[PDB]
Design a binder for this molecule. Structure first.
Ligand SMILES: COc1cc([C@@H](C(=O)N2CCCC[C@H]2C(=O)OCc2cnn(CCO)c2)C2CCCCC2)cc(OC)c1OC
Length: 128
């Protein structure tokens, strides 16, 4: 499935090169520009735990998910990943626990040492 394809073909977009965040572009976006730190960013996404026990979607609540890039408002993997994305881009990320909820997890929703998978669409970004 999509997670396995990322684990095999996905590009390592971490600075440390520890394969903590792997990316595949699934639909190529418009323009050359990607968002800067501090940009207000608008996305739709679907996400799941590797263990299969929890799934989440913006689409579920039908409304775009909005956050300020690079401010740690989301897990580190998103600050890294969404910064590589162009407007209109859809991407897959596979994320080791160190770039998500770590050894502590975020119980009861996320267990300790969880791997996460996301499908993300970058709708738009604006400068603060
Ligand atoms: C850990 O808590 C959460 C995790 C997540 C999901 C998640 O891990 N993320 C949500 C989308 C942004 C990336 C990442 C995250 O940073 O979640 C924490 C988060 C949720 N909202 N925000 C901004 C508001 O402070 C940050 C997670 C994906 C795996 C399947 C179960 C849920 C969604 C949540 O609310 C919808 C959430 O509760 C606040």
């Amino acid at each position: 499935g999509a997670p396995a394809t990322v684990t095999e073909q996905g590009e390592d977009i971490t600075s440390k090169k520890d394969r903590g965040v792997l990316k595949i572009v699934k639909r190529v976006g418009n323009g050359e520009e990607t968002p800067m730190i501090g940009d207000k960013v608008y996305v739709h996404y679907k996400g799941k735990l590797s263990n299969g026990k929890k799934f989440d979607s913006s689409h579920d609540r039908n409304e775009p998910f909005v956050f300020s890039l690079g401010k740690g408002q989301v897990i580190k993997a998103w600050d890294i990943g969404v910064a590589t994305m162009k407007k209109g881009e859809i991407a897959h990320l596979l994320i080791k626990p160190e770039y998500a909820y770590g050894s502590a997890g975020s119980l009861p929703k996320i267990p300790s040492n969880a791997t996460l998978f996301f499908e993300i669409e970058l709708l738009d970004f604006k400068g603060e």
